[PDB]
């Protein structure tokens, strides 16, 4: 909340400094100076506000963010891959169950004793 | 260990089937409550010794089979338990050269 | 937490860039200190964009770890099936012995 607002203010100050550097010395150099000082003070205040919390950095999430993609792009692809994997193992298990049922029917046709005990097992 | 190639899998079926292999199946042998020494304490009844040498004893001297053909221990029994062309061939129990 | 440490590191980098811009404007030329300040400002803007992306990643959908755990469980089940097959293999190795 407040940290996002501070980051947005820092981005706006960066844009203003870039515009002042690009335009002309006419733009008050003291104005950009005070802007940079306020930006440093706000960065220190944001560090103080965010100095004891969370702790869960360990992921390629940074590579996906720096890989010209958001969490819905690379994260979406990862979630789709996980969904494909989970759907595939379910198909595996279902086909295994079907083959087992087929062989159970065949072994019941083979021996009544086996049918009688497949029934005790069930 | 991946295997699973259609060719690799197909080799497995032939090799396994070869080692293993209308009933034409051996006659069901009823259990005998008295055995020649411990069960019937019959000890040696000369009759038992005579029967083993020349008479057909269903399990002491041979395997009866169905269709009536009698196969002695030395002989090899060819039988077809599944309803298919392939026939289980049982090799001789004794195999005395 | 981690975002707070990232913001503190970004502030330290901004202070270092300000010191570098001071050194450049001091020993740097008029058309050099301005360029160095513009480069430091671009770096600070990139750091702020990275912080915004980090916030968007900390937010948005919070199920990534859930999907990762589900995939890990599926992989563990597959590994258990493979271990069962290898156990059957060692059992049959003992069967020939």
């Amino acid at each position: 909340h407040l940290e996002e607002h501070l980051e947005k203010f820092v981005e706006n100050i960066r844009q203003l400094g870039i515009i002042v550097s690009d335009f002309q010395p006419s733009s008050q150099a003291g104005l950009n100076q005070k802007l940079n000082f306020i930006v440093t003070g706000l960065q220190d205040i944001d560090k103080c506000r965010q100095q004891l919390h969370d702790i869960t950095v360990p992921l390629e999430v940074f590579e996906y963010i720096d890989q010209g993609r958001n969490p819905q792009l690379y994260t979406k692809e990862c979630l789709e891959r996980a969904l494909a994997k989970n759907e595939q193992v379910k198909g595996k298990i279902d086909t295994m169950k079907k083959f087992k049922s087929l062989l159970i029917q065949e072994l019941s046709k083979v021996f009544p004793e086996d049918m009688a005990k497949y029934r005790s097992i069930r | 260990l991946s295997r699973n190639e259609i060719i690799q899998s197909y080799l497995s079926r032939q090799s396994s089937l070869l080692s293993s292999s209308a009933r034409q199946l051996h006659v069901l042998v009823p259990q005998s409550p008295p055995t020649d020494l411990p069960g019937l304490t019959r000890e040696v009844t000369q009759d038992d010794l005579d029967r083993i040498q020349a008479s057909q004893w269903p399990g002491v001297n041979g395997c009866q089979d169905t269709q009536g053909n009698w196969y002695d221990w030395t002989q090899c029994i060819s039988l077809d338990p599944h309803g298919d062309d392939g026939r289980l061939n049982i090799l001789p129990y004794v195999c005395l050269d | 937490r981690l975002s707070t440490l990232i913001e503190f590191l970004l502030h330290r980098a901004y202070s270092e860039l300000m010191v570098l811009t001071d050194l450049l404007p001091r020993k740097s030329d008029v058309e050099r200190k301005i360029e160095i300040v513009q480069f430091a400002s671009r770096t600070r803007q990139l750091f702020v964009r990275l912080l915004a992306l980090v916030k968007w990643a900390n937010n948005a959908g919070k199920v990534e770890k859930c999907a990762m755990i589900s995939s890990f469980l599926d992989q563990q089940a597959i590994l258990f099936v493979d271990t069962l097959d290898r156990l059957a293999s060692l059992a049959r190795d003992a069967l020939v012995h």
Binding site: K92, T95, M96, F99 | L1, S2, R3, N4, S9, S12, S16, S19, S20, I90, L91, P92, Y93 | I78, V81, D82, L84, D85, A88, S89, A91, R92, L95, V96
Partner: peptide, 25 residues
């Protein structure tokens, strides 16, 4: 005969192991 019986028992397992392996694969 008895060696054939032992090999047949071992193979009965071979088709179980192999079946499950194929399934997991």
């Amino acid at each position: 005969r008895l060696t054939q019986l032992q090999d047949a028992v071992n193979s009965l397992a071979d088709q179980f192991c192999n079946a499950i392996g194929v399934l997991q694969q």
